Design an enzyme around this catalytic site. Structure first.
Site, mmCIF file in Angstrom:
data_model
loop_
_atom_site.group_PDB
_atom_site.id
_atom_site.type_symbol
_atom_site.label_atom_id
_atom_site.label_comp_id
_atom_site.label_asym_id
_atom_site.label_seq_id
_atom_site.Cartn_x
_atom_site.Cartn_y
_atom_site.Cartn_z
ATOM 1 C CG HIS A 121 -8.940 3.127 12.805
ATOM 2 N ND1 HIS A 121 -10.082 1.916 12.829
ATOM 3 C CD2 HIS A 121 -8.710 3.309 13.445
ATOM 4 C CE1 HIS A 121 -9.498 1.287 13.698
ATOM 5 N NE2 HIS A 121 -8.606 1.803 14.403
ATOM 6 C CD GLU A 122 -8.769 7.551 15.680
ATOM 7 O OE1 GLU A 122 -9.113 7.770 16.926
ATOM 8 O OE2 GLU A 122 -7.577 7.011 15.539
ATOM 9 C CE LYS A 173 8.028 -14.049 23.896
ATOM 10 N NZ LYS A 173 9.189 -13.100 24.415
ATOM 11 C CG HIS A 209 -3.202 -3.373 25.017
ATOM 12 N ND1 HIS A 209 -1.883 -3.032 24.486
ATOM 13 C CD2 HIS A 209 -4.466 -2.873 24.931
ATOM 14 C CE1 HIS A 209 -2.777 -2.069 23.523
ATOM 15 N NE2 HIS A 209 -4.045 -1.739 23.566
#
Lengths: 49, 597
Positions: free
Chosen positions: B356-357, B463, B487
């Site tokens: 992934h990296e 929710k 975030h």
């Protein structure tokens, strides 16, 4: 506005990618004119008998 | 003479001056993360401010070239980002106070902590302290103390700081001729200038809402199965048709359910695929971990990694003298300089994380030939999506047996793969509802449809209907749930995680059709197949220079997002969960509450 400085400096650092690494280029221009020729290739001078 | 010639001239000189300042700004952050020193902390601010003020100085000259006289699509896209003034449109006070709110909210997040109720002396910070304890904690009260007490001093205290963040950011969108701040993030998907491929900003709300309807039957079955295994622990608080507690999701915010894979294992009498014990006997280190992944990109046709990449990598943290952040990140500076800063241990996840990296670095190599302003992903979801398709191929038993990690005699059958799909479903199917739930709530609050007093009333009300989660302790409008999120507090896009699931699966289904693999999708492996790489390389080098709708058609052949690849890859798991849920009720109700009987 609409006025810029044409000369720009090449960023040079050892961490830059190989593609953008600075390469020293030597361009030899071979031109044969009406003047006599001087520069020539090497010689041989083998043994004598 | 025409403005087009003047615009292209401003864009040519901008890439050179911006590439030098942008490279030094990113380079300063590298020395700061790799080594913590008084010199690197200042270099990051100086280099960061020099580049930050550069765009502010160029933005003044960018607004002097209207886009109405420019007939070139690639030219308007470069000036489209420069035309934005950022915080310059905001007032002097609102512009300076905005950075104070972002820095204040970000500081409380890192400095926030919850003292142990049983041990008032010991006070553990959220990360890692509160995030690690909540992962393996099986206690009902232990998980409720840290989960309930966090938002008391955080969610309640961040409410006044969050209110300013909502009013301040809205003034920026209105000055940009945007309907609201919520539409500001949707602008990343905006597509205009190409006939038939135009994508309106408002169309995203309908696509995310239309695609989520098809995920309900898959998530409802996955939720009923998780509630059945945990129903024996607390039958009173856990109803068969009700919802699961909010603090039992396995972590603080319940973003990923992978932590529950231990107790949710369908079959415990069969071994599981792990490369930890296999890599130990093979005696491999961080140096050979990336080298093995580099050969994978070459099998698909992608170029290898430059010498400087592997030489400048950071394979570990040399003690506390020189410390770095172990959080895996792919850093792209410029001038062909690619590096990755991660702490490399021996685990089955690090091997998958290596692909992934490296996917981000490999992705940056295709469009590296594009202009500075044109170097980027087509959207915010393609950054991590291209890296997930690489990890999904390594997790397949076929790829592991190729390099020799897994024994060649390992039996692969339904019982073996069914347990693997469940592990990937919690990390995939688990984030989708939480992503659409939190992202949709921010769009409603910023749009002005939810009064300030109904922030929390609508948060839990939506929710239970979306993710089917109820709050053990009722909260008033004082608390702010998103305020504690990473975030949400750092002003980063939370929608990019939802689209990443649909994009990564579309490429998985399209790339496997080029390699001519047969059988289930999770059995597909793109290794040794050079035909799939050539098709993906075309879009890799395009970046955002072309509309994401057009680039997506050259890969999966679709003009928008589709859930079809989500049902097929999870199809084998859906067929098994449907039978196990026959004795239970599929779905949940929003009229049940743990404190309401």
């Amino acid at each position: 506005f609409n006025c810029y400085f044409p000369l720009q400096s090449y960023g040079f650092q050892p961490t830059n990618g190989v593609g953008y690494q600075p390469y020293r280029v030597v361009v030899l221009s071979f031109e044969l004119l009406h003047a006599p020729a001087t520069v020539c290739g090497p010689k041989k001078s083998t043994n004598l008998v | 003479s025409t403005i087009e010639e003047q615009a292209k001239t401003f864009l040519d000189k901008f890439n050179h001056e911006a590439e030098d300042l942008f490279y030094q700004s990113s380079l300063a952050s590298w020395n700061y993360n790799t080594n913590i020193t008084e010199e690197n902390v200042q270099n990051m601010n100086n280099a960061g401010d020099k580049w930050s003020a550069f765009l502010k100085e160029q933005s003044t000259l960018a607004q002097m070239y209207p886009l109405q006289e420019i007939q070139n699509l690639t030219v308007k896209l470069q000036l489209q980002a420069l035309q934005q003034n950022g915080s310059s449109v905001l007032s002097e006070d609102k512009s300076k106070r905005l950075n104070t709110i972002l820095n204040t909210m970000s500081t409380i997040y890192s400095t926030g902590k919850v003292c142990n109720p049983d041990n008032p002396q010991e006070c553990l910070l959220l990360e890692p302290g509160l995030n690690e304890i909540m992962a393996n904690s099986l206690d009902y009260n232990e998980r409720l103390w840290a989960w309930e007490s966090w938002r008391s001093e955080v969610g309640k205290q961040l409410r006044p700081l969050y209110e300013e963040y909502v009013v301040l950011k809205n003034e920026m969108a209105r000055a940009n001729h945007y309907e609201d701040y919520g539409d500001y993030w949707r602008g990343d998907y905006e597509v205009n200038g190409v006939d038939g491929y135009d994508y309106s900003r408002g169309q995203l709300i309908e696509d995310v809402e239309h695609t989520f309807e098809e995920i309900k039957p898959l998530y409802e079955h996955l939720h009923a199965y998780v509630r059945a295994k945990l129903m024996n622990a607390y039958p009173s608080y856990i109803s068969p048709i009700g919802c699961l507690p909010a603090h039992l999701l396995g972590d603080m915010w319940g973003r990923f359910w992978t932590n529950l894979y231990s107790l949710t294992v369908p079959f415990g009498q069969k071994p599981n695929i792990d490369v930890t014990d296999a890599m130990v006997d093979q005696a491999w280190d961080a140096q050979r971990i990336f080298k093995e992944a580099e050969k994978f990109f070459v099998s698909v046709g992608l170029p290898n990694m430059t010498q400087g990449f592997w030489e400048n990598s950071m394979l570990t943290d040399p003690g506390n003298v020189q410390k770095a952040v172990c959080h895996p990140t792919a850093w792209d500076l410029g001038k062909g300089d690619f590096r990755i800063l991660m702490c490399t241990k021996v685990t089955m996840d690090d091997f998958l994380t290596a692909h992934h990296e490296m996917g981000h670095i490999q992705y940056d190599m295709a469009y590296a030939a594009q202009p500075f302003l044109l170097r980027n992903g087509a959207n915010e979801g393609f950054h991590e999506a291209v890296g997930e398709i690489m990890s999904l191929s390594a997790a397949t038993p076929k790829h592991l047996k190729s390099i020799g990690l897994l024994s060649p005699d390992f039996q692969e059958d339904n019982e073996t793969e069914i347990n693997f799909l469940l592990k990937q479903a919690l990390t995939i199917v688990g984030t989708l509802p939480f992503t659409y739930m939190l992202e949709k709530w921010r769009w409603m609050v910023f749009k002005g449809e939810i009064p300030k007093d109904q922030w929390m009333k609508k948060w839990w009300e939506m929710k239970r209907e979306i993710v089917g989660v109820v709050e053990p302790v009722p909260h008033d409008e004082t608390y702010c749930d998103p305020a504690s999120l990473f975030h949400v507090s750092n002003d980063y896009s939370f929608i990019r995680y939802y689209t990443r699931t649909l994009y990564q699966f579309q490429f998985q289904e399209a790339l496997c059709q080029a390699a001519k693999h047969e059988g289930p999708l999770h059995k597909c492996d793109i290794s040794n197949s050079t035909e799939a790489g050539q098709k993906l390389f075309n879009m890799l080098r395009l970046g955002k220079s072309e509309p994401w709708t057009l680039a997506l058609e050259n890969v999966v052949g679709a003009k928008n997002m589709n859930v079809r690849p989500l049902l097929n890859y999870f199809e084998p798991l859906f067929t098994w969960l449907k039978d196990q849920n026959k004795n239970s009720f599929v779905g949940w109700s929003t009229d049940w509450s743990p404190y309401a009987d």
